[PDB]
């Protein structure tokens with residue numbers, strides 16, 4: 001659509017960014033969508049690690065699950081220095097996991113080396129009946145308690161491509 005126009009604009013952009021959130025929160029699906037189902041994936045530093053380097057065009061994305069490999073957390077956090085932005089993805093329909101996930105976001109932004117980096121929280125799976133909306137996400141994840149930086153929250157759906165356009169707008173506009 002116009003969505004396809006933003007995808008093209010987005011992959012010419014020279015930026016690093018990070019996509020992190022709990023497992024099964026829609027992370028790879030989201031890349032699928034904005035990459036039109038074609039991209040390169042490479043475990044970092046090598047195979048065996050949770051961390052993945054998505055590349056396509058000029059964009060490189062550092063992608064990991066919070067809780068995939070707890071031992072390597074510090075290594076992952078530190079790898080996310082210098083990024084243009086943080087995309088923190090949550091399943092807005094899985095309300096039982098909201099508290100735990102809200103906590104690792106706050107933990108993540110408590111870290112000095114990641115000071116000042118913009119955060120887009122995405123409340124995915126909006127299509128599922130009863131999934132948390134934008135206002136509620138902000139509420140239940142205490143997003144107003146984060147003010148050391150620029151922080152934005154959108155509700156989206158990868159399976160329906162709802163709000164992916166404004167997401168790409170946000171991202172494209174936040175390259176350094």
Ligand SMILES: Nc1nc2c(ncn2[C@@H]2O[C@H](COP(=O)(O)OP(=O)(O)O)[C@@H](O)[C@H]2O)c(=O)[nH]1
Pocket residue numbers: 022023024025026027028029030065124125126127128156157158159160
């Ligand atoms: N209903 C719905 N399911 C989704 C959406 N996005 C992803 N999923 C599903 O959520 C599950 C986890 O997806 P995945 O991208 O692999 O999660 P990841 O571990 O965060 O990368 C899969 O079954 C997806 O098909 C969405 O917007 N709506």
